[PDB]
Write a protein that binds this ligand. Structure first.
Ligand SMILES: [Mg+2]
Ligand SMILES: [Zn+2]
Length: 332
């Protein structure tokens, strides 16, 4: 279904007036509420980041093809509290700051940077606010399909499929200007990055990245790839690296998705983890502190110590968000 000229022009008119999209403290929530067309603003942020980078022009992607691509991604995100178009635009923006303020561009080629920024926008296509466990535990059609076809990353495979479908049309194929090994690397690296977002693979992905970083004779291609996976992973859990108020808003939104899954799980007669249980009302702060201590702090501290020195601010910001959550608890 082609993109109208009207859909494009609506995005193209957006000014972005009091906003620096390149900055680590960019506030997507304030961008949304400053317009009655927040979905067009979101699209314009992605469009301007991408064009502003110089990367699409280097790889033969025209302005029009880029914008069509962004709009075809947008059509496939749903009206869910968290895993929506704003999330992926946020991940794109955040990865941009990791590459260009955190200087991770030093570890990757320009092609890999372009692929990562594009991959951010496809990485949760058609998410329905339900995680992989829901599908496997309820024996839903997608769960059965995954089980029968091998791979337990139900959603990530689904997202890759839709990404491939979008890119198979030349009018939205941001990789159309590539050929041969470069076009293959684009698709293979996109898919690997998206598959690496499944949190069941978190420890394995991290170990593999760290082992590959410690090894000076690492297969360069595989180290580059690992770096891409880790950067998409970092963007995906980057809410805790943001100014506290921004971090808190994302945490409220994800929590609402967890509760809606738990409602759906209860009414299907399946097991509900207490974090998903609306009626066993839980403290936002303990959940954030839990995530920080067991997942995010070691992840970001390790990748920074191992090789990504320029992303030091992420560790500092996690440390200060954690302390703030700890004071929310201490004063209750
Ligand atoms: Mg995902
Ligand atoms: Zn995501």
């Amino acid at each position: 279904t082609a993109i109208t000229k009207v859909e494009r022009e609506a995005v193209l008119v957006c000014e972005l007036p009091s906003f620096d999209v390149t900055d680590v403290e960019f506030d997507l929530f304030r961008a949304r509420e400053s317009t009655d067309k927040p979905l067009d603003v979101a699209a314009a942020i992605a469009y301007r980041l991408l064009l502003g980078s110089g990367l699409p022009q280097k790889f033969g992607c025209s302005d029009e093809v880029l914008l069509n691509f962004i709009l075809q991604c947008r059509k496939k995100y749903r009206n869910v509290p968290y895993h929506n178009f704003y999330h992926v635009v946020d991940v794109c923006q955040t990865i941009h700051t990791f590459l260009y303020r955190g200087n991770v561009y030093e570890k990757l080629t320009e092609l890999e940077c372009f692929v990562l920024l594009i991959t951010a926008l496809v990485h949760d296509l058609d998410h329905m606010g339900l995680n992989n466990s829901f599908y496997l535990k309820t024996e839903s059609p997608l769960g059965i399909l995954s089980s029968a076809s091998g791979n337990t990353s139900v959603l990530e495979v689904h997202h890759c499929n839709l990404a491939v479908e979008i890119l198979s049309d030349p009018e939205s194929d941001v990789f159309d200007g590539l050929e041969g090994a470069e076009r293959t690397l684009a698709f293979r690296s996109m898919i690997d990055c998206v598959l690496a977002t499944d949190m069941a693979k978190h420890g394995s992905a991290l170990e593999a990245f760290l082992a590959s970083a410690a090894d000076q004779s690492s297969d360069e291609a595989a180290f580059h790839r690992m770096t891409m996976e880790i950067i998409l992973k970092a963007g995906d859990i980057s809410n805790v690296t943001k100014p506290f108020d921004i971090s808190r808003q994302w945490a409220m939104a994800v929590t609402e998705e967890f509760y809606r899954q738990g409602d759906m799980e209860k009414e299907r007669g399946v097991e509900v983890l207490p974090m998903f249980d609306r009626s066993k009302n839980m403290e936002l702060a303990k959940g954030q502190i839990g995530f920080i201590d067991f997942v995010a702090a070691p992840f970001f501290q390790k990748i920074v110590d191992a090789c990504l020195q320029g992303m030091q601010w992420t560790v500092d910001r996690i440390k200060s968000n954690r302390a703030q959550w700890e004071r929310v608890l201490e004063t209750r």
